[PDB]
């Protein structure tokens, strides 16, 4: 019965005294400067320039000498500007969107002032005006003069729209009567559709020490079917001189340590992974005594990398609770799993950096005595489900307990030497026995592999252990005779021979645990195909698909490079395009193998060749593209998302998903999962709603973050039974129009291979469309007949821009991502251009959906003259596509009917038809 008065009064009363308070700060102060220390002989001068900030800078000083210490009088310096102009530019805008940019002009002047603001039109942006006047001597954008009062602030907007992809320069002129001031700003224009990355690796061993010689590889130029028009393909090439050379380059070549994946940082796991590259790099450097690579001082780099290491280790301390138990999320219920994982981290790091021994002991004790069963198996504490396992409910729970036990055995084994203890050794024997005698009834190669590694770090003389070893060796998968590649899968009922040749996070995990087991058991002749596979399965960033696979895979690679003695690196390398000319050639030695990653500029089939030399050279090429459709992909989730409106009142967004398990999977739901919602251009979301969906005991999601206009959530499990929905209000920041759809993606965290993607939007109707709305898209001539005469159509038809002129019939109309694809069958040919148009083939046409001028009717015959004939290559075939411009000709074709005007129309049309079919021009 309360109105909206008490409604907010209640939450205002309950905000306080239930909690004590929360730590946080609403202001930000950047890195301080002038921290230098100097020796002054009674006189010194240091000149420099101030930062751009409106700030009172208090510059104070201290000094000491053999006399003592002296406090210099604090000097006051305040940077201020009375007339200042702020400019708001969004992170990213997609071409074709009519977008107004708003900006705020502020004035501190005593009294009122009037101003003007000029927009600088850059050649790839229609201003809806094109105000630039080149008529007179000095060119300007004109202006709308606006006024502001004294010490006031006024808003000014400008409506624009991009054309070229990524046109980054726009100028703004602020003009008062006192004069002018210039503000340069950048505009990000991003391709439409969705980003997708294809990875092609190759390993180089010209000597064939490791079982094959490879001097060359060809990565072709493959255009995707759904690729967005007017968008070129991105190619990045990385050439490094060792199996781990790409990781080392990830640490050293880029000063800041880059996240190896695009996965979100929310979980404590992702914070733990941030120290992995620094650690393993340190391991290879110190153990093999390879520090000689630095031309600079080696020891300085030892202290720098050691410091990065310690900082990365203390990075995850925030998730540690009061009992030294580590929780998967901040303040959440601690999980035995993540605690064991962190115990493995600290257990390995304690070699080169001594951690707190007491804390380690307390953690081990907590997970050991806190959660363990009477048979030695381990029970998971929190509701966190690390992975989904094959088999029905008894098989899935049994397999899950097996996986958790093997995992915690791995962790405790790695860290045991820091705090050797009677009790933890006893429980180690318990869980080890459970693994030994319950693993042999094998179910999936995943669990068998992880148990094989856990038991591999323990006693290696057990006959049951060697039996598990013989079975996992029985499950191997090999490519080539003699063995070239070797890896593993999930083999339960999958014992049929199938290799889709698609890298799976789960697959890389299984084969990784197998490899580590081999490295500890030291069977070398068995290993080389596996490292041959993983070294070519790596990405440019040095990271693999997921976290769990990447950690163990990197440890395997590093230990391999540290066991078998690396060979001296001497190679003459060159990359060149097949038909096109040659690109940069790498002459690579032990000194510079870290050289720059080079992007492949030209579009051609790529070929890499090497002369005779020794060593192991990793060459990886990653390829970024955009495409318009998800219809080809493999969707693992029911997805539905839409936008409602409420009753001040706002707009609402709701997304929903459900898990679609495979036949081997059970109905228990999904594992740790992530929901990414791309926000359309110029509309934000309500922080308070998500913060409410997270921060309390009923939490529907464990963590939320907003990154670069993306709303990303994490959740323990996605139920297969019904739909789960996230719901939040949204805000319109500025007026947008003809906005392009955005992406809604859901995937499993530890195996992104299971994912589903979807396009979504707020809502769409027609705008009026007047000023520069249609950009060179389409024109359609009127129905029936006009003053248009067949010989004028002869002028336009044989026009050298026009390649082809023929009439066709409408077959199909498909709407794909703001772009219209018309299937049509040919009718009568007159003159064709460089492309061959066969009779009655099903061809395609493209249309920009924002154009209400030219539209097409279902199944009606039309006369078309196109200027351009476009081609695409599948490498086995070449398919043609016909663009539709505003310079292309479209005229309606009636069928045989006698309307009062029809006869003369068919007369003109046939007259032109036979005039041009005469090859007259």
């Amino acid at each position: 019965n309360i109105s909206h008065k008490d409604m907010q009064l209640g939450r205002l009363h309950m905000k306080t005294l239930l909690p004590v308070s929360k730590p946080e700060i609403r202001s930000y102060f950047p890195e301080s400067w002038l921290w230098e220390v100097h020796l002054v002989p009674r006189r010194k001068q240091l000149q420099f320039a101030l930062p751009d900030s409106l700030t009172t800078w208090e510059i104070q000083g201290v000094g000491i000498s053999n006399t003592g210490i002296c406090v210099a009088d604090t000097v006051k310096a305040k940077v201020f500007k009375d007339v200042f102009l702020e400019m708001n530019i969004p992170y990213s805008v997609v071409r074709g969107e009519q977008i107004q940019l708003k900006g705020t002009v502020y004035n501190y002047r005593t009294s009122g002032m009037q101003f003007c603001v000029k927009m600088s039109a850059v050649e790839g942006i229609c201003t809806s005006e094109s105000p630039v006047i080149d008529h007179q001597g000095t060119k300007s954008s004109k202006c709308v003069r606006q006024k502001v009062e004294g010490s006031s602030s006024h808003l000014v907007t400008f409506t624009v729209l991009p054309l070229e992809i990524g046109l980054h320069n726009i100028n703004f002129s602020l003009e008062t009567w006192f004069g002018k001031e210039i503000l340069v700003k950048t505009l990000r224009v991003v391709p439409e559709g969705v980003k997708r990355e294809s990875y092609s690796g190759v390993t180089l061993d010209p000597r064939g020490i490791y079982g094959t010689i490879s001097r060359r590889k060809e990565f072709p130029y493959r255009i995707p079917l759904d690729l967005v028009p007017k968008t070129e393909i991105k190619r990045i090439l990385s050439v490094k001189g060792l199996l781990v050379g790409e990781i080392l380059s990830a640490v050293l070549s880029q000063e800041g340590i880059n996240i190896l994946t695009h996965l979100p940082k929310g979980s404590a796991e992702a914070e733990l992974m941030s120290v992995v590259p620094v650690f393993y790099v340190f391991h290879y450097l110190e153990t093999g005594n390879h520090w000689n690579i630095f031309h600079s001082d080696p020891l300085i780099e030892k202290q720098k990398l050691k410091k990065k290491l310690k900082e990365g280790m203390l990075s995850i301390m925030s998730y540690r609770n009061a009992d030294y138990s580590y929780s998967v999320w901040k303040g959440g219920s601690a999980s035995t799993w993540l605690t064991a994982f962190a115990l493995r981290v600290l257990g390995q790091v304690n070699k080169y950096v001594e951690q707190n021994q007491n804390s380690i002991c307390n953690s081990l004790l907590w997970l050991v005595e806190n959660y363990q069963l009477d048979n030695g198996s381990f029970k998971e504490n929190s509701q966190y489900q690390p992975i989904k396992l094959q088999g029905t409910l008894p098989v899935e729970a049994r397999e899950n307990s097996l996986y958790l036990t093997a995992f915690t055995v791995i962790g405790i084994r790695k860290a045991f030497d820091i705090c050797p203890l009677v009790k933890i050794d006893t429980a180690l024997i318990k869980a080890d026995n459970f693994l030994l005698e319950n693993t042999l009834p094998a179910q999936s190669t995943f669990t068998l592999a992880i148990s094989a590694y856990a038991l591999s770090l323990g006693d290696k003389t057990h006959p049951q252990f060697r039996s598990i070893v013989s079975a996992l060796k029985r499950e191997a998968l090999v490519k080539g005779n003699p063995p070239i590649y070797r890896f593993w899968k999930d083999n339960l009922q999958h014992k049929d021979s199938s290799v889709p040749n698609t890298g799976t996070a789960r697959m890389v995990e299984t084969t990784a645990y197998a490899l580590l087991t081999s490295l500890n058991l030291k069977d070398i002749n068995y290993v080389n195909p596996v490292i041959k596979w993983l070294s070519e399965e790596q990405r440019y960033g040095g990271g693999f698909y997921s976290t769990q696979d990447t950690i163990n895979a990197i440890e395997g690679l590093t230990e391999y490079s540290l066991l078998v003695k690396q060979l001296r690196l001497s190679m003459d390398i060159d990359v060149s395009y097949k038909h096109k000319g040659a690109l940069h050639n790498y002459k690579m030695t032990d000194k510079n193998f870290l050289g720059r990653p080079v992007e492949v500029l030209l579009n051609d089939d790529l070929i890499v060749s090497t002369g005779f030399g020794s060593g192991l050279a990793t060459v990886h090429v990653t390829t970024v593209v955009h495409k318009t459709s998800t219809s080809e992909e493999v969707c693992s989730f029911y997805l539905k998302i839409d936008t409602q409106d409420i009753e001040s009142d706002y707009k609402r967004i709701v997304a929903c998903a459900s898990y679609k398990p495979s036949r081997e999977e059970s109905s228990s739901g999904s594992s740790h999962a992530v929901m990414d919602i791309s926000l359309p251009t110029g509309i934000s979301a309500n922080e308070e709603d998500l913060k409410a969906l997270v921060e309390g005991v009923d939490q529907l999601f464990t963590d939320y973050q907003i990154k670069d206009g993306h709303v990303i959530l994490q959740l323990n499990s996605i139920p297969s039974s019904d739909f789960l929905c996230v719901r939040f209000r949204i805000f319109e920041l500025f007026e947008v129009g003809f906005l392009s759809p955005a992406t809604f993606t859901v995937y499993e965290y530890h195996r992104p291979d299971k994912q589903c993607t979807m396009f979504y939007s707020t809502s769409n109707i027609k705008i009026a469309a007047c000023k520069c709305v249609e950009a060179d898209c389409g024109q359609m001539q009127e129905e029936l007949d006009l003053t248009i005469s067949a010989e004028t159509r002869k002028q336009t038809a044989c026009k050298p821009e026009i390649a082809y002129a023929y009439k066709v019939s409408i077959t199909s109309i498909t709407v794909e991502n703001v772009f219209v694809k018309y299937k049509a069958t040919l009718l009568d040919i007159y003159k064709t251009g460089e492309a061959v148009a066969e009779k009655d083939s099903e061809i395609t046409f493209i249309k920009k959906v924002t154009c209400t001028n030219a539209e097409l009717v279902k199944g009606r015959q039309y006369l078309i003259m196109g200027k351009e004939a476009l081609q695409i290559k599948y490498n086995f075939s070449f398919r043609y596509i016909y663009p539709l411009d505003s310079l292309t000709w479209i005229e309606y074709w009636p069928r045989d009917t006698t309307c009062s005007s029809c006869q003369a129309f068919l007369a003109n049309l046939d007259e032109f038809a036979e005039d041009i079919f005469l090859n007259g021009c």
Partner: antibody
């Protein structure tokens, strides 16, 4: 080009609101402010107000505050003027002018209207 | 806020005389002043802007001096086109203002 059309002579009672309008032709209508000024006969002239066509932004003299109404029509490129509760001594010659804002410290009243003679009904 | 007064009300000028008309303001407008003339019953034409510069179609017979809070206008020789009423204005602060007018005494 530069063309500003002025309304015709109106005669209305002491306190009946009177309307006078100005038409804009030849230039871009909504990109330049329009100014209204009054000359009382035989003596100095007084600045009255300004309006932004298409933004509808208005400002007036505080002496004539709440005696004055300016409206804008982009269809016919016209601006309308209404004066309520005026009297016999207000009636005078009224003009429109275009403010030209230069890209330097050059600020003009550029094109002018023909003027409207407004008179009180007696 | 800011407003100015114009002086004098009138001055005697022969056909070949040399005369001056000035105005002055509340606050310093720097160079913000404009001068224009009005013939009886007609719209005024812009003559001087920025207190210095000459408009196009305006002869060089019209000179002016523009700095500070006080502004002056100088005519060395009068012409048959120079008999009218005159007005001065500031373009700077939000409330544009004007002057009180100047009458020309035609004959000596």
């Amino acid at each position: 080009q530069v063309q500003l059309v002025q309304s015709g002579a109106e005669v209305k009672k002491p306190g009946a609101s009177v309307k006078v309008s100005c038409k804009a032709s030849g230039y871009i209508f909504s990109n330049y402010w329009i100014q209204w000024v009054r000359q009382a006969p035989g003596q100095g002239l007084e600045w009255m107000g300004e309006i932004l066509p298409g933004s509808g932004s208005t400002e007036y003299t505080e002496n004539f505050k709440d005696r004055v109404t300016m409206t804008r029509d982009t269809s016919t490129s016209t601006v309308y003027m209404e004066l309520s509760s005026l009297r016999s001594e207000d009636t005078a010659v009224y003009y429109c002018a275009r403010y030209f804002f230069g890209s330097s410290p050059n600020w003009y009243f550029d094109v002018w209207g023909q003027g409207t003679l407004v008179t009180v009904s007696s | 806020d800011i407003q100015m007064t114009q002086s004098p009300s009138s001055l005697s000028a022969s056909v070949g005389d040399r005369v001056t008309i000035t105005c002055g303001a509340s606050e310093n407008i720097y160079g913000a002043l404009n001068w224009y003339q009005q013939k009886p019953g007609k719209a005024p034409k812009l003559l001087i802007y920025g207190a210095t510069n000459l408009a196009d179609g305006v002869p060089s017979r019209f000179s002016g001096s523009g700095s500070g809070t006080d502004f002056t206008l100088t005519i060395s020789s009068l012409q048959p086109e120079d008999f009218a009423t005159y007005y001065c204005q500031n373009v700077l602060n939000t409330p544009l203002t004007f002057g009180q007018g100047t009458k020309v005494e035609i004959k000596r």
